[PDB]
Amino acid sequence: AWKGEVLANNEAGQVTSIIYNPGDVITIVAAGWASYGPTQKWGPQGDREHPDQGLICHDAFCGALVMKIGNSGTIPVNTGLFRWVAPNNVQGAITLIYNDVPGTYGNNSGSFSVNIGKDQS
Amino acid sequence: AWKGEVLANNEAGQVTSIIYNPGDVITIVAAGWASYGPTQKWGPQGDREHPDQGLICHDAFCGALVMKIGNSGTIPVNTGLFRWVAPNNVQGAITLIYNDVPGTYGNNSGSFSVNIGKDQS
Amino acid sequence: AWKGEVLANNEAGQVTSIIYNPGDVITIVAAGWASYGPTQKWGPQGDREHPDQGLICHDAFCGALVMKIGNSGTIPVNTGLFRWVAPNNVQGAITLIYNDVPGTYGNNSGSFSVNIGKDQS
Amino acid sequence: AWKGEVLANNEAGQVTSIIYNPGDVITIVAAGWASYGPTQKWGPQGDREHPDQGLICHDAFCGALVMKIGNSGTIPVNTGLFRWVAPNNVQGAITLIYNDVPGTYGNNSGSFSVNIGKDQS
Ligand SMILES: *C(=O)c1ccc(O[C@@H]2O[C@H](CO)[C@H](O)[C@H](O)[C@H]2O)cc1
Ligand SMILES: *C(=O)c1ccc(O[C@@H]2O[C@H](CO)[C@H](O)[C@H](O)[C@H]2O)cc1
Ligand SMILES: *C(=O)c1ccc(O[C@@H]2O[C@H](CO)[C@H](O)[C@H](O)[C@H]2O)cc1
Ligand SMILES: *C(=O)c1ccc(O[C@@H]2O[C@H](CO)[C@H](O)[C@H](O)[C@H]2O)cc1
Ligand SMILES: [Ca+2]
Ligand SMILES: [Ca+2]
Ligand SMILES: [Ca+2]
Ligand SMILES: [Ca+2]
């Protein structure tokens, strides 16, 4: 299992110790407060009122937590995943990333605290 | 394991099928959007800018998800709990509740989707 | 989870730290060598060639591992149980016992090493 | 998780659906009765009184259950493994095999019923 923080201003994302293998069942819980610029802060589901101006993940709001598994495209995590199985042929290290527009991470602030574990299967 | 919705306007709370027993390890993931009145909505951590005007749980924001276990006081759930063990002598059915001021639930809207499972121990 | 030894000559049985609660899923693995009298030894499934002359559990061979849950009757364990759920209304502390005829445990020898854990549910 | 039978006379072994990956925790429970030739039968720990005359696994008795993981050497399973982690660099499909001398499986009989699951980690 892995526990750590994902900084909102980390454009490259946070590589975890979790390697997702075919058949794996995982659970993720994410908490905390972060911003993509404004003085306010939002939770792991991001800002439901903000337009998508070229986010790294178009299936989650700006300011949401998302992930990549190996060289997959971005996958929404939001508040977390409960006993979740990845799509076919998706495998590899899990990287957690704050959802923002590439090149605009410099003014981000805060972080999410995240736990990831493999479930019995 | 239990999956279900918790309505923001349900003052009594949602009784789950989960009975927390001594030694149990549990994981909860909560997602979704709800409101304690305003036209906006907030996630399971609630509204970090709103004052506490007599919330059922003073350790979480207005609009956050909280719970009771048996006849315990309110315990913050927020976005969830990862492989969590309850305090000493806390046991019984888990009831999930939206955090608002008693008598003011009538104008609430939305709900959280919540999963609860017992972990290996 | 619980790990310990169950002596063949312990007529009262070995009380474990496991309390089986309704809904619980458990796994048990038992190993080792024991005897109900003879110089030979048998594994946790006992002696398949020996008649039942008044065993505490008539659903397992003499020399097998069995258990009681709370005040239940004896239940066969043998080599173990995989993600097992108890019958309706069966609950309480798990006691492990060597299957022999009451009053004849004094000449028994050896023991089984046993692990018990609760599974995710 | 995988459940199936391992025939005593299957020299090649029974390939399971389980792929053991680095970091995996697994539990195995094996039960039943089998023989390497004689009219008697023995459990998954095999025959503790029989000499090793060139067994595929020298760390378990003749008639015991053993396994290979990928291209590893034989590893004793016996009655099972509880929340077990493989040695460094051992990975791949789990094959279950009855422990006997190569070329002598033709007169074997019976089988073991085996469950294998991955545990939370
Ligand atoms: C209008 O209400 C508004 C527009 C942008 C904004 O913040 C920027 O959002 C960008 C992503 O859409 C990017 O993250 C910039 O760094 C932010 O300043 C707030 C409000
Ligand atoms: C301040 O501008 C403000 C005050 C109240 C409010 O909504 C109410 O909040 C109450 C709890 O504090 C309760 O939930 C009421 O039903 C809401 O109308 C928003 C903003
Ligand atoms: C005959 O083959 C035979 C009969 C009894 C025996 O051992 C006794 O078995 C009893 C249970 O049936 C009890 O455990 C006694 O303590 C044993 O001596 C071995 C062989
Ligand atoms: C001695 O009494 C004795 C010798 C062999 C035997 O069975 C054979 O065991 C071999 C492995 O050691 C192999 O499995 C043969 O197929 C068996 O016939 C029983 C007793
Ligand atoms: Ca930004
Ligand atoms: Ca309200
Ligand atoms: Ca005896
Ligand atoms: Ca043979």
H/E stretch holding C72 reads none
Protein residues placing their CB within 5 Å of the ion ligand 7: C 36-37, 100, 104, 107-108
Task: Find, among A104, B79, B19, the residue nearest to C22 by Cα.
Answer: B19
> Could you give the count of Cα atoms lying within 13 Å of C113 in the half-sphere of its Cβ?
7
Nearest CA to ligand 3 atom 7: C37
Q: Distance between CA atoms of C76 and A111, rounded to whole angstroms?
A: 52
Chain centroid, CA A13 distance in Å: 8
Interface membership of C3 toward B (CB under 8 Å): no
For B121, which residue in chain D has the nearest alpha carbon? Answer: D120
Secondary structure of C74-97 in HEC code, one letter for each residue: CEECCCEEEEECCCCCCCEEEEEE
Q: Where are the beta strands (DSSP E) in C8-108?
A: 14-20, 26-35, 65-69, 75-76, 80-84, 92-98
Nearest CA to ligand 2 atom 2: B50
| DSSP single-letter state for residue D101 | -
| DSSP single-letter state for residue D110 | E
Q: Distance between CA atoms of C32 and D100, rounded to whole angstroms?
A: 20
CATH number of B1-121: 2.60.120.430
User: DSSP assignment of B89-108, as one string?
Assistant: T--EEEEEEE---TT-GGG-
H/E stretch holding D8 reads none
Which residues, 6 or more positions from B35, have their beta carbon under 8 angstroms from its beta carbon? Answer: B8, B41, B42, B63, B108, B109, B110
Q: Distance between CA atoms of D18 and D70, rounded to whole angstroms?
A: 10
Q: How far is the CA of D37 from the centre of ligand 8 (A)?
A: 5
Q: Distance between CA atoms of B95 and A29, rounded to whole angstroms?
A: 20
Interface membership of A52 toward C (CB under 8 Å): no
Q: Distance between CA atoms of A7 and A32, rounded to whole angstroms?
A: 11
Contacts by A3-7 with C-beta closer than 8 Å and gap 24+? A3/A113, A3/A114, A3/A115, A3/A116, A3/B82, A4/A113, A4/A114, A5/A111, A5/A112, A5/A113, A5/A114, A6/A30, A6/A65, A6/A96, A6/A97, A6/A98, A6/A111, A6/A112, A6/A114, A7/A98, A7/A108, A7/A110, A7/A111
Q: Using CB atoms within 10 Å of the CB of residue B102, give its burial: 0 to 12 exposed, 13 to 18 middle, 19+ buried.
A: exposed
Which residues, 6 or more positions from D39, have their beta carbon under 8 angstroms from its beta carbon? Answer: none
Token code pair at residue D41: 């039968």
Which residues in chain D are closer than 8 Å to C115, comparing Cβ atoms?
A: 82-83
Chain B to chain C, count of Cβ pairs less than 8 Å apart? 22
Resolution in A: 1.7
Which residue of C35, C53, C58 sits with most ligand 3 atoms within 8 Å of its CB, as the best mutation to test the pocket? Answer: C53
H/E stretch holding D3 reads strand D2-7
For D52-61, b/e burial (b = at least 16 CB within 10 A) is: eeebbbeebb
Q: How far is the CA of B53 from the centre of ligand 2 (A)?
A: 9
Which residues in chain D are closer than 8 Å to C79, comparing Cβ atoms?
A: 29-31, 43-44, 79-80
Q: Where are the beta strands (DSSP E) in A1-121?
A: 2-7, 14-20, 26-35, 65-69, 75-76, 80-84, 92-98, 109-118
